[PDB]
Amino acid sequence: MDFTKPETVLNLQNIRDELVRMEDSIIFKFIERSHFATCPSVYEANHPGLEIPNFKGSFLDWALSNLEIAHSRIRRFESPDETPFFPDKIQKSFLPSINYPQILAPYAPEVNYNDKIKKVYIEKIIPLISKRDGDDKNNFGSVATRDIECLQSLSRRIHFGKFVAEAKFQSDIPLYTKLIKSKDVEGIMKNITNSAVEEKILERLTKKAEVYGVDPTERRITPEYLVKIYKEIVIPITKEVEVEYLLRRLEE
Amino acid sequence: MDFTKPETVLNLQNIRDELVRMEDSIIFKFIERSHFATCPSVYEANHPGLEIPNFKGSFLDWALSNLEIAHSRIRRFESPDETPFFPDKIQKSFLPSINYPQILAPYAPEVNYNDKIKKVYIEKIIPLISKRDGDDKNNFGSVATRDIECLQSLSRRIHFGKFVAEAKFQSDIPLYTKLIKSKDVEGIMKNITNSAVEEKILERLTKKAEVYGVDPTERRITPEYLVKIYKEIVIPITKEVEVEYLLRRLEE
Ligand SMILES: O=C(O)[C@@H]1C[C@]2(C(=O)O)C=C[C@@H](O)[C@@H](C2)O1
Numbered sequence: 001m002d003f004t005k006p007e008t009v010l011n012l013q014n015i016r017d018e019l020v021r022m023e024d025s026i027i028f029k030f031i032e033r034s035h036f037a038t039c040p041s042v043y044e045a046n047h048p049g050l051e052i053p054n055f056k057g058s059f060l061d062w063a064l065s066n067l068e069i070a071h072s073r074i075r076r077f078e079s080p081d082e083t084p085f086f087p088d089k090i091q092k093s094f095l096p097s098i099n100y101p102q103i104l105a106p107y108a109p110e111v112n113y114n115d116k117i118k119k120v121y122i123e124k125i126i127p128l129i130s131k132r133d134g135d136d137k138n139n140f141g142s143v144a145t146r147d148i149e150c151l152q153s154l155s156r157r158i159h160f161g162k163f164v165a166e167a168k169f170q171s172d173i174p175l176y177t178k179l180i181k182s183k184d185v186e187g188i189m190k191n192i193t194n195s196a197v198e199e200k201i202l203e204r205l206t207k208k209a210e211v212y213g214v215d216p217t218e219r220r221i222t223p224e225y226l227v228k229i230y231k232e233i234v235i236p237i238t239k240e241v242e243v244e245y246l247l248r249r250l251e252e
Numbered sequence: 253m254d255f256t257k258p259e260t261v262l263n264l265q266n267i268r269d270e271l272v273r274m275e276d277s278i279i280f281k282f283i284e285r286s287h288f289a290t291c292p293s294v295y296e297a298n299h300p301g302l303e304i305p306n307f308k309g310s311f312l313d314w315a316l317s318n319l320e321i322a323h324s325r326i327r328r329f330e331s332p333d334e335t336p337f338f339p340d341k342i343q344k345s346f347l348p349s350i351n352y353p354q355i356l357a358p359y360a361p362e363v364n365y366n367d368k369i370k371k372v373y374i375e376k377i378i379p380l381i382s383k384r385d386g387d388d389k390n391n392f393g394s395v396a397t398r399d400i401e402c403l404q405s406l407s408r409r410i411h412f413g414k415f416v417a418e419a420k421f422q423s424d425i426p427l428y429t430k431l432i433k434s435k436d437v438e439g440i441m442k443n444i445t446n447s448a449v450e451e452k453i454l455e456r457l458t459k460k461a462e463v464y465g466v467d468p469t470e471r472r473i474t475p476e477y478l479v480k481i482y483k484e485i486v487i488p489i490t491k492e493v494e495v496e497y498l499l500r501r502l503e504e
């Protein structure tokens with residue numbers, strides 16, 4: 001899957017294959033985060049004791065914005081598969097730009113569930129991957145840099161819905177246009193949903209959490225929890241993206 | 253440990269013994285619940301398909317509330333070791349009362365972690381003990397009556413912290429008095445924590461699971477998941493109960 005060969009990107013099989021690769025990445029990251037306590041204070045906005053002057057948001061928010069300018073600089077978000085958490089806040093870098101040929105429809109960057117993803121990650125995901133419960137007072141930074149990678153992976157994967165969506169739209173334009181004009185939510189949804197694929201996903205994840213999750217000579221990840229997570233969050237939201245993208249697919 | 257002989261209830265060893273008998277009980281209940289699936293729907297609040305007239309709450313909530321009034325009728329909550337889930341929804345019985353002498357301080361009934369207990373049980377425990385993943389449309393009541401059973405045990409056990417707390421308090425009033433006035437959490441926390449004791453507990457659970465969990469002629473419960481639960485939820489929340497009890501211990 002090459003980003004300057006529109007064809008090799010708008011290929012569903014490929015797209016799924018890439019998603020499969022991400023499974024491990026995401027796993028590895030969860031595994032990492034498991035080492036530290038929950039660290040409530042890190043996600044709590046404007047925490048006294050962790051106040052950063054002229055800045056409003058949570059320790060994590062800060063950490064995430066800083067990092068985003070760093071990645072911003074090495075041209076990260078200039079890429080269609082990369083969508084920033086603090087979008088209206090990054091600057092055009094000091095580096096020639098890779099001129100990625102248009103694959104997705106122009107408004108594509110506007111679709112941005114990071115607000116949701118960040119939220120659900122903090123509230124639903126954290127309790128399931130973190131070990132102890134409480135504030136690990138001198139690992140806030142640690143915890144933070146980790147939450148960020150999880151978050152970025154999570155976002156890449158999830159925001160992949162746009163490609164899938166586009167790819168599918170291609171496969172049957174009349175059918176989709178109809179549904180879209182119709183603003184037929186349930187109709188589109190059931191058409192894009194393929195329970196068989198998502199069925200295999202949940203199965204393999206269980207196996208991976210079992211091998212990677214234990215010292216091969218312990219238990220940094222809970223198989224059932226990972227399923228819970230992908231089932232209740234990862235897969236659901238990817239589909240939200242898919243439909244939202246689809247509706248606006250006939251704009252001017 | 254006789255509830256009409258206060259001194260025998262305020263003996264730390266006795267309290268510990270009773271907490272041991274409970275291990276089996278809980279295992280049994282867990283073992284029972286393990287026969288049915290996760291059954292998501294039983295937990296979803298006001299589920300379209302299970303809607304109960306003039307009632308906001310989940311199927312479980314209803315099963316739980318009803319059951320509580322039943323036990324309420326047979327004087328269940330009139331005792332210091334039983335703390336209800338819907339505390340103010342309970343009516344006094346039609347039955348001459350047992351007259352328990354004071355053991356705990358008056359505000360005791362107010363210390364109530366059942367919201368957390370119920371919520372954690374639903375999100376962390378259920379996935380670990382239920383066999384498969386999905387809804388068993390004609391076993392919701394079963395799942396529900398057993399969940400409640402697990403719930404009442406956990407609740408009894410966890411809330412035992414109050415007795416422990418009151419005990420440790422008696423053992424060295426001046427020391428705790430200081431910590432309380434200071435409202436020194438970490439100070440109380442590490443002063444009431446006995447890791448040798450909690451270490452021994454995890455040990456025998458591992459074994460108990462290996463024997464009760466398998467048909468002596470399989471695997472209703474992993475000794476690993478059992479250990480996980482007590483370590484992450486049971487013991488932790490029991491300690492929360494002990495701190496708060498102590499903090500409020502100096503009230504007028
Ligand atoms: O077709 C697809 O592959 C994509 C991705 C998806 C997932 O979350 O993996 C898998 C199955 C489909 O129902 C949805 C969600 O569209």
Ligand SMILES: O=C(O)[C@@H]1C[C@]2(C(=O)O)C=C[C@@H](O)[C@@H](C2)O1
Pocket residue numbers: 268271416444445446447449450453486487488490491494
């Ligand atoms: O001393 C105690 O007995 C009580 C109960 C407790 C537990 O949860 O088992 C066991 C050990 C202590 O560290 C805490 C938690 O207080």
Ligand SMILES: N[C@@H](Cc1ccc(O)cc1)C(=O)O
Pocket residue numbers: 071074075076077079082
């Ligand atoms: N793939 C692009 C965009 C990118 C940059 C940095 C990243 O961390 C991720 C993606 C590049 O490497 O130029």
Ligand SMILES: N[C@@H](Cc1ccc(O)cc1)C(=O)O
Pocket residue numbers: 323326327328329331334350
């Ligand atoms: N032990 C008391 C209170 C009690 C009632 C019902 C129960 O389910 C449990 C405890 C009694 O039975 O007299």
